[PDB]
């Protein structure tokens, strides 16, 4: 209902793919202490369901869980406390252009080479 066609860019009703289906790694969303700290905040159950939906296909290897884990971590951080130390167990090491340093709570101030 919110599609916005534009000139040449017509479109049609997008419909769910008709494709059906053990990497149970993300079960730690409700087990590991690092994630457990967030349980008082947003519940993991929707994210565990999102796991199951992905895992059903999750075309690939040890990636079926990383998106959901990262999303849960970001949601918890936005909601309040930020999950420190996660990504050290099984996450996909969120991609970075170079100088691999994916770090929770990196100040945007980010003192750079040429700064006052």
């Amino acid at each position: 209902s919110w599609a916005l066609s534009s000139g040449e860019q017509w479109c049609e009703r997008a419909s769910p793919p008709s494709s059906s289906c053990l990497w149970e790694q993300c079960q730690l969303l409700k087990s590991t202490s690092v994630f457990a700290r967030c349980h008082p905040l947003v519940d993991p159950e929707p994210f565990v369901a999102l796991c199951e939906k992905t895992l059903c296909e999750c075309a690939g290897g040890l990636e079926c869980a990383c998106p959901a884990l990262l999303e849960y971590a970001r949601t918890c951080a936005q909601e309040g406390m930020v999950l420190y130390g996660w990504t050290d167990h099984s996450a996909c090491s969120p991609v970075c252009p170079a100088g691999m340093e994916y770090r929770q709570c990196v100040s945007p101030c980010a003192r750079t080479c040429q700064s006052l």
Partner: protein, 63 residues
């Protein structure tokens, strides 16, 4: 201004419902002023499901 709710369609709406003012219709301009029809075409193209079909409808209405 339905086109505000769909900003992506502004370019097409402006550049499409302009043949009404183009020389192709200068023969009719004197017969009928395409002010209401241009406004209707712009309101249609940028407000309906299929932009090109509504452009057809409006331009054909003026014709």
């Amino acid at each position: 201004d339905p086109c505000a709710l769909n900003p992506r369609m502004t370019r097409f709406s402006e550049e499409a419902c302009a043949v009404l003012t183009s020389p192709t219709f200068e023969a009719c301009h004197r017969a009928v002023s395409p002010l209401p029809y241009l406004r209707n075409c712009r309101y249609d193209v940028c407000s309906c499901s299929d932009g090109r079909e509504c452009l057809c409808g409006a331009l054909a209405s003026y014709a």
